[PDB]
Write an enzyme that holds these catalytic residues in place. Structure first.
Site, short mmCIF file in Angstrom:
data_model
loop_
_atom_site.label_atom_id
_atom_site.label_comp_id
_atom_site.label_asym_id
_atom_site.label_seq_id
_atom_site.Cartn_x
_atom_site.Cartn_y
_atom_site.Cartn_z
N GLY D 231 0.81 -1.21 0.00
CA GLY D 231 0.00 0.00 0.00
C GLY D 231 0.84 1.26 0.00
CB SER D 232 -0.13 4.84 0.58
OG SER D 232 -0.59 4.89 1.92
CD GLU D 251 7.05 -5.31 -2.35
OE1 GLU D 251 8.05 -6.02 -2.11
OE2 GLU D 251 7.02 -4.49 -3.29
CG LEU D 252 5.80 0.97 1.53
CD1 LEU D 252 6.75 1.69 2.38
CD2 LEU D 252 4.51 0.73 2.28
CB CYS D 286 3.41 0.28 -7.05
SG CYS D 286 3.22 -1.38 -7.76
CD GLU D 380 2.74 6.06 -5.86
OE1 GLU D 380 2.70 5.98 -4.62
OE2 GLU D 380 2.70 5.06 -6.62
#
Ligand code: NAP
Ligand code: NAP
Lengths: 480, 481, 480, 481
Positions: D231-232, D251-252, D286, D380
């Site tokens: 996620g963020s 996992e960003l 992502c 982002e």
């Protein structure tokens, strides 16, 4: 007065009432050393001592094998110049190249010392399917047993090291037969191993005998592995007569090199092509025999290369400035002179050299030599480079592969896809990128395809051929 | 009835033409049940040329393509399961239980291969090990060896062909397979499956069942880069001697021993595994438990229980579900076993059970204290014969296990930690079976022998290694702008 | 007169006008050394120098990193006794144990030197399915960046080595905060590293500061990894305040040991149980705190063990014969005396010792101590062993796991299935078979489960946490 | 019409009971298409206790059992292919082409996992490295970590759940999965598949789609041994800070750049891959190519070709085959992108195309020379926005690529050997894509970020490693009689 050396039989120095084998200074052609000639009984006794020493060699702790190899490293460093001078004397190679060989030998034993404490196994799950429920395995590697080693004349120390160091790193007893013309390097190694207490008695025997007396090294059933480094025809015939034992073959080559770019620049490129084409007077298995230069660079490379060939210092190998010394023999030099003459008679354009003065033969560059000529077809093993022009890269790779050899290849390119196309399609054991095919790192997997051999040297790879796989298949181990 | 007409494979295509027929007999009824076309010298030469021509395309395949080929074989083997099992029993004489077991083993062999085809990893190696080598790095990759020559035996006509064929496809090596003349149908059904797969290039395979007198090229021909043989020791060692330049893989015979130092987990299970080891497929196995070493304190209890279980074994029609052991491959083979049993008894051996012959059928036999001079002890029996021995010292039992020119597998029944690992360390074999008979093999394990039992290892990932050549890309200052 | 030492800031020795931190001889309790106290600015400057040195550290050749580590090995061997004497003085551990720690430290750096030239990558096929046709990858490992290291007092040299050696082997700059009570060992390491030319400037900083000044070692965003060795509560709180950075936690333990057999004999078994229970006065993370003995051996083991405990020589750590010296402090010794008294008051049967004489506390053996007692529940970190009898093996393994710690466990068994049942079901990082849980090889993966920590030390394993994975995904590379 | 009633999973069983309903909207029509039961605090606490209780059984499973579970998921995903793809498009708003692509990716993820479950290898290590350590050897094995907490995002509601679920089953770890509230259906269909598999023990899984305000236990609870979050960045880093003792996988987000130094193999293919990178799933990825760096000599030729290809992109109903980009997840998300585009232009950026908003739909946008102070460059974007830049020196372009607090992936188009390897060496990312945009991911590759993009790696064999704990058996003179 010549120096009297000792041979090694069941870890012990011997001379007794054995006849003497003369070792000549390859430059002065005068006898500089006397080596005892080993008998048929000596060989038979050395093999029996290796069989008897195999359980003790296999029983050694990893740290003990490591300690043996580290003591060799220490002694080689301490006798550095002495070994280098001996190497130059018995082989005819320049002193700078003899020093380089001692440095490479030190690295070979150092890698072997580190690899001796790193022989890992696997824990494997074996319950891959329902019928195999409750099964697990331990895969371990064990010494193969007695090793037969036969080495050539051109690298009488490092090529012996690439066999001896993995054998000690694994715990394999061995019997070495070095080349009759160059045995001193192998005998100095025997002198070092003899005074190591951790190495069991009968672990090694170094017997310099002529090829007509060394049949047992090939055929004898007491050896579990034969590791040979030398010429193709001799090696392939030894594999055919070897019997049941495993075989490792490090044979000849006709190494090509593609020049599609200057990497990083023209001067460095020529300096590396000179190295490839004339290091040790082309008396190397990875000597750059064939040079393929792209049409747009052809004339600029041809001019620069030929000018650098003419600038090479040939003479006394004991002199610091000497780039190339004499050939192993006058006979060898005559053969190169004959093949150069034939190549020119068959249509080849002689750019430089080609003349002989006893054992000395001038650095030669021959342009557009046909496939029917011996200089193009067969391994030259001399200071001769065959120049060719190409227009299409794909066709140059096809020409590189147009040989019955397959040791190493070289490629000079700034192009990403050409570099990886060559890696994929060059029929060799090693592809040298932005250096000549004459480059070898002692830790890399080294060996050939086609007539260049079978299996790989480079310490951790040679150790694998000296190790046998054993699996412990465990059924419900851990079930109370 | 009428024999089934089969087709041979030449350059991926089925062929019969005007070739003479080779008869395949039902090993139980001894009647001709199948007709196979006899391949010629030209057929072999043409198959080798087609494999050479197909090598670039085989090497060019994507990993997913090789996996897709192997997964299609798995699917088809599952779909024709009973058909293959019935064919296996018919052409070899093995019971249907043991045949079904071989088809299941073959499915796993191709499945392991499918998975390994997308897992051929290479290395990134630092080469700047010393100052001289500054700025050097390497990429080590593995490439197909090229055309492979395959020669398989009669006893496992499907699984032992799979242990060669599956790694070859997983790697991308074209091949020419010479299966055993007596058992070719299993290899030909594999050819029928392969022929229908579109992803597999043309000329990738040829299956030529020829007699040993016609199959010389399979050994000597320089167009093959590897010879992989599974069969008898003397034949194999002679093939290695005549092979020339090519690499060689030798899966040969065995005289497998088993130590019973404890009952693991209990006596009933131990005897059940010893029976499996001694009489699975009537001892016509390379890992057949020929020798049984039992500690003196368990000797009588094991001898009584084992002999009683041997006498209870059902021998007869291999097509029957209850049949434990069928007939031998031939009456000639059965006669040889009967002769060696008779010799073993004449040399001092005590016959505990069996030893009698009824045509191709030979009774499950147990012979006590047979001397080393007897053929039954020295040489591989490859029959339903188990040699019983007593021991008092464990160290001496391991030394006795190793007292053979063979060295395929060994077995050990122990609850002791140090005995288990002493045996693993000192047994001169490729595989030590702990708390099972030496007759155990997992298709993913490294399998092969020491001494006269061979050289190299099978088991899919290990066989693939022999079919791969190492190539290094030595990079000088790559990444320097 | 106390010896004046220097601290290390950006590879340089510093003292200046910094206030002095006293280091006492843990036996005489007199000041034997004076160490400069590092400031907040010193820590901030050390972190900035490590950030600035990270590109140069990452740019070093494998042989350069190898050369740095081999120079440390050479210097440690040369200053062997000096370091051992310093170790004994600042920690209170016997001289034989201090010498053992220097030997282990030499092996740690030697393994790291060998591992520095062995950081392998992978070539991976990526064409796993049809949509991924023409894809391949190169997987390589790169230094993580600046490392924060916090070490304990009990092994002030080897536990610093298990952090420093992997950092140099990989090419990671670092800032070390050793324990205030034992900083000399870490400072001698700084003296060795300072005179190594191959190691770039700012690669290291060794700043011995008290816990109330070392907050930046935990929270600072400029560190990419925090590697801590010390007590559980301190470590877990540091992980919670660490921020974005990766964390390695080497914490406490309450190590149990099962005795189901005598392996190989009773004398050797007792000798190893004595080692486990009282090596360094039980002031080890893998000290054998709990002993579980099978009922059929219980009385024979109890008698033999207690008699061996009473025979242990306690006194001056500088004496050769001394088995156990004093505790790090009188405060620490008082705490052990209190927990022994509580254990006896809660139902425990005192078999031997339990009495205190200043910083010295007698080797103690307490039988059947309940779970509610602090001596059973919490890590003792003293010369105290808790004896228990068991009848069922499965229940003893369940009792071994009846703890919030999970560092190491020990098992004495001749049984194949018990050995593997314990390996499968013991909730620890390491299961010691036929030795006490107090055994550690510097190359083994070492670390805990539960409250004992996260991640693994042991050179090649610690290097992994200091390396980041990078993949080069190549689309049709080699297509002309 | 009428919304489809789904079931949530609690201790491997489907549940609905008297729980309140959570509405799931069709992201294109903005109408309620599904009703999902809302899990309670007790439901979460009970799911965690069931995972703790199931951990011994999960750890006790045979490797073949774990493989069988994963192969059954592969079979069911293939069988319900279109149904899952339609559901994916409906709940996320992604085009059907991109949804079908995600189902195919998920099938490969479980297939890789099935194969890896029977390949968890250990080591046999010599420990007699020095004289002090004589007679020591070791067995290093890997064991499941225990209960795993999984938190997944909305943009890949199936494949990113698969990258957590598949390694957990391949290892034998029980888990509790909290999928995104807006996209839970994909995770619930996985639960429906898992529920029917008998080999998977009871309590092995629970799927509880709850809002972020109710999912605190997923972070803090000491019963979980690992937290794996996708996620963020700000949410993830705060979760790592509140996680306690447990291991963490992050996992960003990313701000992925791409260098175009050459056309590989040609200009058309290069533009086609740059479009994919910049506008696949409307930049709601992502590994979305947010930044494009083109060498000055190719700048105008690329800018013209790229902008023309952007204007040709079909935007509309995600259910239509021809649709390249559908709507954003919400109108709020689309408004934020419109605001950042407006700000980027106001700060000096040159708008080449798009920038206009029609509800949840936002036009594919290309903005030239946007400064570092603008949110579109710094943060982002996660939208159909590409930031175009020109460079003259390659070394400086790599330095610009690294000029971000992110570091997930980077892309490079080069025919140059040294540039390719310079980029691999100096790009501060987890993955360097060579001759493709940074938007490329293979499910077997190590995937993850540097800097604010996370910690640890996904890709099946790498994620399994984080779910495994190392245990060594140190053996003193084992095998000594
Ligand atoms: N692949 C590699 O790594 C590598 C490296 C270096 C050189 N080489 C190749 O080696 C060759 C140069 O060496 P060389 O001239 O010394 O080669 P060679 O004539 O084949 O001899 C090599 C060794 O084999 C021995 N030998 C010859 N015939 C034998 C037989 N019938 N039985 C047993 N031993 C026998 C020789 O003994 P005597 O000298 O005592 O007669 C010598 O020790 C070139 O072809 C070169 O390419 C290969
Ligand atoms: N797992 C292993 O490998 C291993 C090995 C050995 C020991 N240990 C464990 O270590 C403990 C014994 O060592 P110890 O008594 O020195 O442990 P400790 O009190 O936790 O201290 C360890 C280190 O942390 C520092 N420290 C304490 N609080 C801090 C804070 N708030 N911020 C930053 N640094 C802080 C200490 O500094 P000061 O001393 O300057 O205050 C010291 O350098 C035992 O629990 C033992 O099991 C574990």
């Amino acid at each position: 007065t010549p120096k009297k050396y000792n041979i090694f039989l069941a870890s012990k120095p011997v001379d007794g009432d054995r006849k003497w084998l003369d070792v000549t200074n390859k430059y002065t052609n005068d006898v500089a050393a006397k080596v005892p000639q080993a008998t048929h009984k000596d060989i038979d006794d050395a093999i029996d001592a290796a069989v008897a020493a195999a359980p003790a060699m296999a029983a050694m702790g990893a740290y003990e094998r490591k300690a043996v190899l580290e003591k060799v490293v220490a002694e080689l460093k301490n006798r550095f110049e002495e070994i280098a001078q001996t190497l130059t004397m018995e082989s005819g190679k320049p002193i700078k190249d003899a020093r380089g060989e001692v440095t490479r030998t030190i690295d070979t034993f150092q890698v072997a010392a580190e690899e001796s404490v790193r022989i890992y196994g696997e824990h494997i799950p074996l319950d891959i399917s329902a019928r195999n429920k409750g099964l697990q395995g331990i895969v371990k590697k064990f010494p193969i047993g007695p090793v037969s080693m036969v080495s050539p004349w051109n690298f009488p120390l490092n090529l012996v090291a690439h066999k001896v160091a993995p054998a000690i790193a694994v715990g394999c007893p061995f019997v070495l037969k070095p080349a009759s013309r160059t045995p001193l390097s192998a005998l100095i190694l025997g002198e070092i191993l003899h005074k190591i207490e951790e190495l069991p008695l009968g672990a090694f025997s170094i017997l310099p005998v002529s090829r007509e007396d060394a049949d047992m090294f090939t055929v004898d059933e007491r050896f579990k592995l034969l590791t040979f480094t030398g010429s193709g025809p001799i090696g392939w015939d030894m594999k055919a007569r070897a019997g049941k034992k495993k075989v490792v073959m490090e044979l000849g080559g006709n190494a090509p090199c593609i020049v599609d770019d200057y990497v990083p620049d023209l001067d460095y490129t020529i300096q590396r092509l000179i190295n490839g084409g004339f290091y040790q007077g082309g008396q190397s298995c990875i000597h750059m025999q064939r040079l393929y230069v792209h049409e747009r660079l052809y004339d600029e490379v041809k001019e620069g290369f030929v000018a650098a060939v003419k600038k090479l210092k040939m003479g006394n190998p004991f002199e610091e400035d000497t780039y190339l010394g004499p050939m192993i023999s006058e006979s060898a030099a005559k053969g190169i002179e004959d093949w150069v003459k034939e190549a020119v008679a068959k249509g080849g354009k002689l750019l430089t050299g080609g003349n002989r003065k006893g054992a000395f033969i001038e650095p030669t560059v021959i342009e557009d030599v046909p496939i029917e000529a011996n200089a193009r077809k067969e391994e030259i093993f001399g200071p001769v480079v065959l120049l060719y022009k190409y227009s299409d890269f794909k066709e140059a790779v096809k020409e590189c592969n147009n040989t019955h050899y397959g040791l190493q290849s070289g490629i000079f390119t700034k192009d990403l896809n050409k570099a990886f196309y060559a890696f994929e399609h060059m029929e060799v054991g090693g592809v040298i990128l932005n250096d000549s095919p004459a480059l070898r790192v002692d830790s890399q997997p080294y060996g050939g395809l086609k007539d260049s051999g079978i299996q790989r040297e480079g310490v951790k790879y040679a150790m694998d051929d000296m190790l046998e796989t054993k699996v412990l298949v465990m059924r419900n181990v851990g079930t109370l």
